[PDB]
Amino acid sequence: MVLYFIGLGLYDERDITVKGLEIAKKCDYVFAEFYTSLMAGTTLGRIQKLIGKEIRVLSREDVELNFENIVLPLAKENDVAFLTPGDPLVATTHAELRIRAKRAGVESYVIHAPSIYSAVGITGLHIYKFGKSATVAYPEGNWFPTSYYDVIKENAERGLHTLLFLDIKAEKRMYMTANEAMELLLKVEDMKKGGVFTDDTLVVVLARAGSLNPTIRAGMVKDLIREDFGDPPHILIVPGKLHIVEAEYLVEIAGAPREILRVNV
Amino acid sequence: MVLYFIGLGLYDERDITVKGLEIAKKCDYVFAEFYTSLMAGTTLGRIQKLIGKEIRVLSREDVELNFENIVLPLAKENDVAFLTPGDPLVATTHAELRIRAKRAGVESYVIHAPSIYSAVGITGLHIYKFGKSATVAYPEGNWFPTSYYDVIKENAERGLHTLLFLDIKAEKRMYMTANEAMELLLKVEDMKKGGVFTDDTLVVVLARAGSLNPTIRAGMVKDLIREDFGDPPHILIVPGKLHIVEAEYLVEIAGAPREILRVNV
Numbered sequence: 001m002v003l004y005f006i007g008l009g010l011y012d013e014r015d016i017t018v019k020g021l022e023i024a025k026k027c028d029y030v031f032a033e034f035y036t037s038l039m040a041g042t043t044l045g046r047i048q049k050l051i052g053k054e055i056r057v058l059s060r061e062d063v064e065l066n067f068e069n070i071v072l073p074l075a076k077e078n079d080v081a082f083l084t085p086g087d088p089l090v091a092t093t094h095a096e097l098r099i100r101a102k103r104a105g106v107e108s109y110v111i112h113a114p115s116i117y118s119a120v121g122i123t124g125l126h127i128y129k130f131g132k133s134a135t136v137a138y139p140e141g142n143w144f145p146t147s148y149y150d151v152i153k154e155n156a157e158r159g160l161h162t163l164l165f166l167d168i169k170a171e172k173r174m175y176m177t178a179n180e181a182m183e184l185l186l187k188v189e190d191m192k193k194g195g196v197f198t199d200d201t202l203v204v205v206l207a208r209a210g211s212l213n214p215t216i217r218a219g220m221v222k223d224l225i226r227e228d229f230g231d232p233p234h235i236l237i238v239p240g241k242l243h244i245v246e247a248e249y250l251v252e253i254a255g256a257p258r259e260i261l262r263v264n265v
Numbered sequence: 266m267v268l269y270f271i272g273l274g275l276y277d278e279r280d281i282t283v284k285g286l287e288i289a290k291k292c293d294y295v296f297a298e299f300y301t302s303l304m305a306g307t308t309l310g311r312i313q314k315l316i317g318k319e320i321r322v323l324s325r326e327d328v329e330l331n332f333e334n335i336v337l338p339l340a341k342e343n344d345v346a347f348l349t350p351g352d353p354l355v356a357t358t359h360a361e362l363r364i365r366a367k368r369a370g371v372e373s374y375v376i377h378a379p380s381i382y383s384a385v386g387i388t389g390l391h392i393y394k395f396g397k398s399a400t401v402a403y404p405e406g407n408w409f410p411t412s413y414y415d416v417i418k419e420n421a422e423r424g425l426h427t428l429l430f431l432d433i434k435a436e437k438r439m440y441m442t443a444n445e446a447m448e449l450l451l452k453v454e455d456m457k458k459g460g461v462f463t464d465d466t467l468v469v470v471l472a473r474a475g476s477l478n479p480t481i482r483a484g485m486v487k488d489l490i491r492e493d494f495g496d497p498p499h500i501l502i503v504p505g506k507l508h509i510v511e512a513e514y515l516v517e518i519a520g521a522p523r524e525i526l527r528v529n530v
């Protein structure tokens with residue numbers, strides 16, 4: 001009679017941990033959500049096949065408004081699993097679901113999986129140097145989000161790197177590309193004119209982390225803004241002050257212009 | 266002709282991903298290092314039995330100084346795996362190893378696994394709110410390093426959380442406990458007197474992340490400094506001002522005192 005929060009990882013069904021698979025295989029009921037992120041290398045069918053169980057996919061509304069009405073009731077008399085892309089508690093509001101579980105007298109356990117938050121290490125940027133993170137959200141009607149711009153500014157001032165999760169509208173099958181994020185940021189720059197994000201700003205793009213051949217690119221906005229980084233999901237990173245080896249990796253592995261090997265200490 | 270950087274995950278032999286395991290099983294040679302961290306919930310023997318391959322352990326020197334003489338030569342005409350605790354390329358100097366592979370004409374691929382950087386989300390603290398990270402190092406001789414204290418200071422004043430890795434002597438198998446970290450920080454506070462880390466400071470402790478029964482505790486330093494958080498590894502976090510939802514999770518899940526709902530929000 002417990003509830004398992006199990007992450008499925010970055011790209012495909014094989015990104016789940018062995019621990020997660022063995023536990024998921026023995027659960028009575030299996031639920032999942034695929035609106036918090038995109039696993040571009042798999043399908044519901046493949047996940048079901050691997051786990052050996054049928055999976056009931058839930059919408060944001062099902063979860064946020066009815067988690068305690070759909071999932072928790074079953075967890076009070078069975079072993080239930082709730083699957084999610086990447087790590088279940090990273091950049092989601094799922095942690096609060098553990099509180100709902102407690103209040104309902106249901107014990108819960110978390111099985112982690114690879115997350116985009118730590119996968120950034122593949123960009124060569126020292127992970128400890130990342131500062132506050134943010135999300136580039138799609139403008140809606142007259143509402144144009146801009147707080148993510150101030151985050152970059154705050155981190156840059158401290159010489160820290162900025163991780164930018166990109167927006168997603170799963171129900172509309174919309175996945176923000178690094179290109180779109182760059183366009184939005186340039187627009188905010190025109191408004192705020194803080195010299196935070198311009199055509200000459202160095203950026204790093206990581207697409208489909210978790211796949212065997214992810215797209216890792218680095219360069220100035222003007223040169224990458226119209227580049228094809230492949231299918232989603234994508235994340236955008238605005239590095240702060242670079243260490244020599246970070247610059248070297250970006251050039252040798254991310255194909256950045258040799259010009260960036262030159263660091264301004 | 267191929268080198269695989271494979272993460273072993275957080276705690277035991279089952280924290281490796283299905284993808285990582287299947288690939289490791291297909292490799293002709295398997296190397297590993299346990300100097301950046303140790304898998305406290307398992308043993309080399311259990312990891313070997315799981316992968317079904319003998320695992321040649323490499324020391325810090327083997328890797329940092331002779332990676333190209335020990336690992337790469339074999340990767341030239343065979344499939345080779347390099348296992349590391351957590352997620353590959355998180356340890357600061359590992360990304361550079363991919364450059365060495367390139368220089369040696371060896372292709373490399375990264376197989377991700379859970380990292381403490383994302384696993385800390387189990388503390389209920391929002392991932393985007395974490396700022397720069399640091400390691401609490403033991404003082405020694407005439408050397409008393411305190412930069413980690415400055416990191417906490419800079420993050421906190423900006424309302425950001427600070428992830429603190431605790432010192433470890435892998436070879437001697439000696440881990441710094443959260444308790445020792447707190448005493449050190451209080452000692453540093455007495456030195457710099459910046460009102461950054463005191464007996465009333467709210468801290469969070471995460472022990473054995475990855476296990477099914479991790480220890481998650483939160484409260485003021487004066488009340489936690491003498492508490493038993495169990496066996497290592499331990500991770501210390503000095504949260505910035507809390508979102509009410511973060512505070513509620515710490516109270517309901519981490520046994521934090523009701524007081525934080527008004528004092529640290």
Ligand SMILES: Nc1ncnc2c1ncn2[C@@H]1O[C@H](CSCC[C@H](N)C(=O)O)[C@@H](O)[C@H]1O
Pocket residue numbers: 010011036037038085086087088089090091092114115116117164165166167168206207208209210233234235236383
């Ligand atoms: N494999 C991947 N490659 C690139 N970006 C990814 C990614 N997986 C997730 N993201 C990024 O993160 C956003 C979802 S945020 C939810 C993250 C998830 N809990 C995790 O642990 O990874 C996406 O819109 C995208 O910008």
